[PDB]
Amino acid sequence: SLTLIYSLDQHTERPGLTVKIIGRQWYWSYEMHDHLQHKLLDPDRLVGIAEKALVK
């Protein structure tokens, strides 16, 4: 039981979302303000493709 209590914090990863929950009379309110960024998926294959496009 003590081991289950101390496992309630699971911040050992990169957090991916935050949601602000607000309780009012009588309804719930949900909020978010995060940032979406894009990353080239495996760019080194595109880097090599451009390399062999420029070498000839």
Binding site: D34, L36, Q37, L40
Partner: peptide
């Protein structure tokens, strides 16, 4: 060829 990723407070 783009991978979306969401950034929150650390």
């Amino acid at each position: 060829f783009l991978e979306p990723e969401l950034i929150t407070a650390p």
